[PDB]
Copies of this chain bind each other. A is one copy, B any other.
Amino acid sequence: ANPCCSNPCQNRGECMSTGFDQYKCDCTRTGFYGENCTTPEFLTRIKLLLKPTPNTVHYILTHFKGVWNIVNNIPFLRSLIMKYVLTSRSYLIDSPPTYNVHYGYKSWEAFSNLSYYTRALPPVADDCPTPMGVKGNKELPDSKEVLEKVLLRREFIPDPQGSNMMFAFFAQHFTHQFFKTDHKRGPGFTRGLGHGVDLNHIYGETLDRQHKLRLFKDGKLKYQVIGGEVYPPTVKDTQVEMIYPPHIPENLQFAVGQEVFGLVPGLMMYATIWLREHNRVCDILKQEHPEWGDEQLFQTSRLILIGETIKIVIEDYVQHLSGYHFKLKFDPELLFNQQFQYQNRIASEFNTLYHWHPLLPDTFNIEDQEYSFKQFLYNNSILLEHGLTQFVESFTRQIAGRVAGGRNVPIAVQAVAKASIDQSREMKYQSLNEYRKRFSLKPYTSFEELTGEKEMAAELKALYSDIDVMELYPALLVEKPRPDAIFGETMVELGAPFSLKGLMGNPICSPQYWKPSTFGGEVGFKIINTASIQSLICNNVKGCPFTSFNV
């Protein structure tokens, strides 16, 4: 019914109805003109002719190790390439943000209401004849069938990049500060009103919760000691609400910033590590500033840990994921002579993309034990039983599952994968190929090209019929991986822009914040600029065990 239902405008042109059966494309600043913005301007053709494909660039970044080592030791050159990585696809994220689940056109409501996830592509209008707009059948294929035929794990498929459980739980822990879906409102809504890396998963989303978690001495967070080891405090002691089954003993109801982090001992592990890190930084700052009060010690520590988090995410986490030989760098100064918006709004599609449950193993292997999902979930006695040191040693060695390549979602979380499919549809996501085009990728022309195989392709073809009707979320998990990589092209090219924007968009990266006095002087500053996943663990885990994001 809506004449824009077919998504006729190309190259990020905007579709507007101009009557009941007519549309106009707004081609402003697309670099294209014509009825659906498909005729390139002269400068546009030039850019197209020279532009290498993502797969080409990825080849270059994952080969020529000798050249990159040279590059990695020339600071001017390293900065130049990193600046490039940051800016080079800046243009892909709308900032200030635009659409959301209820608005397929720009509006003050969509801009101003922070309870929404934002949208990289507007929803398919309600009165469109098909789920994807006009293509495909009246109904999408049964989600349970899509799940079982191409998503569910048969045999465990290990990640060829060697991601471990330290990585898997870091990813879960880190992302769950800004992926916090407000289920009473709906899948397109979030409880993370900071829309980014504010460390609310440690400090709490609201002031009241934060104040319940704080010691109000020396800037510190409340904690308890169990068997000589520092752990988070209890629900009983703090009165902060946590989600626990009713049979969890009170001494085991740990209280942390994020209410769901008692779900898994792997999350509780990182919650404990970061809590220890906060109180460590408090000690350092108190030493530097005996004249400071509790409030300033707390606030400054929080800013430093925000810095540490961004530092580690870029130079260890993203570094490992990328498989690049180039050494990524956290350096806000790189953007100071660039056009860049220091703000971020979390996209629903980013949330969708990041459902990396194929990472999960069949069992969680700690010391000599192999825990089932049933044994692991909501069981912090496991963390207490083995301790942090053994957790780190064990998880550093246990390999995680491959995310792309198909059929690697453990059946234990099959309902989660199904919900990702069903909620994608509920939120009226456009198709895989629409999203590929939105991020300057070539549409897939068959299911075999998507998977790079034959059997899953075929089951998919029977289910969806048209490649242009293939859905975003299942496509990510069945996509042909990059060579010996964890992800395919679509995951990387859509996810990377959201990721860097969410990291660099933080106010501590802005010129007025990025200076030593913000962090209590050069000592605080150095904590950020020398942070690593290894030093995080070394400083806060007894025995300073070796760790890494790969086995």
Residues on A close to B: CB < 8 A?
A: 14-20, 24, 26, 28-29, 94-96, 98, 103, 105-109, 111-113, 194, 198-199, 203, 207, 288-292, 296, 299-300, 302-303, 306, 337-343, 507, 510-513, 515-518, 520-521
Given contacts A96-B342, A106-B518, A109-B299, contact A292 B507 (CB under 8 A): no
Contacts of A302 in B (CB 8 A): 107-108
Contacts of A109 in B (CB 8 A): 207, 299
Q: Are A16 and B105 in contact, with the CB atoms below 8 A? A: no
Given contacts A105-B299, A198-B108, contact A18 B507 (CB under 8 A): no
Q: Are A108 and B289 in contact, with the CB atoms below 8 A? A: no
Q: Are B26 and A299 in contact, with the CB atoms below 8 A? A: no
Q: Are B290 and A28 in contact, with the CB atoms below 8 A? A: no
Q: Are B289 and A105 in contact, with the CB atoms below 8 A? A: no
Q: Are A513 and B29 in contact, with the CB atoms below 8 A? A: no
A303's partner among B18, B108, B338 (CB-CB below 8 A) is B108
Whole-angstrom distance between the Cβ of A357 and the nearest chain B Cβ: 31
Given contacts A339-B339, A341-B342, contact A510 B290 (CB under 8 A): no
Given contacts A194-B112, A510-B96, contact A521 B24 (CB under 8 A): yes
Contacts of A342 in B (CB 8 A): 95-96, 341, 343
Q: List 13 A-B contacts (CB under 8 A).
A: A16-B517, A17-B289, A18-B288, A18-B289, A19-B290, A26-B517, A28-B517, A96-B507, A106-B518, A112-B194, A112-B198, A113-B207, A341-B343
CA distance A518 to B103 in the complex (A): 12
Whole-angstrom distance between the Cβ of A29 and the nearest chain B Cβ: 6
Contacts of A290 in B (CB 8 A): 19-20
Contacts of A108 in B (CB 8 A): 198-199, 203, 299, 302-303, 306
CA distance A16 to B285 in the complex (A): 13
Given contacts A292-B17, A521-B16, contact A516 B26 (CB under 8 A): yes
* Residue in chain B with minimal CB distance to A505: B96
Copy number in this complex? 2
Contacts of A26 in B (CB 8 A): 515-517
Q: Are B512 and A98 in contact, with the CB atoms below 8 A? A: yes
Whole-angstrom distance between the Cβ of A219 and the nearest chain B Cβ: 11
Best-surrounded residue of A103, A112, A292 (most CB of chain B within 10 A) = A112
Contacts of A291 in B (CB 8 A): 17, 19-20
* Residue in chain B with minimal CB distance to A291: B20
Contacts of A19 in B (CB 8 A): 289-291
Given contacts A16-B517, A291-B20, A303-B108, contact A512 B341 (CB under 8 A): no
Whole-angstrom distance between the Cβ of A158 and the nearest chain B Cβ: 39
Best-surrounded residue of A95, A96, A103, A292 (most CB of chain B within 10 A) = A96
Q: Are A96 and B198 in contact, with the CB atoms below 8 A? A: no
Contacts of A507 in B (CB 8 A): 96, 111
Whole-angstrom distance between the Cβ of A359 and the nearest chain B Cβ: 30
Q: Are A29 and B96 in contact, with the CB atoms below 8 A? A: no
Q: Are B16 and A520 in contact, with the CB atoms below 8 A? A: yes
CA distance A76 to B507 in the complex (A): 35
Given contacts A26-B516, A112-B198, contact A300 B105 (CB under 8 A): yes
Extra inter-chain contacts (5) besides given A108-B199, A109-B207, CB under 8 Å: A28-B516, A95-B342, A108-B198, A108-B303, A341-B342
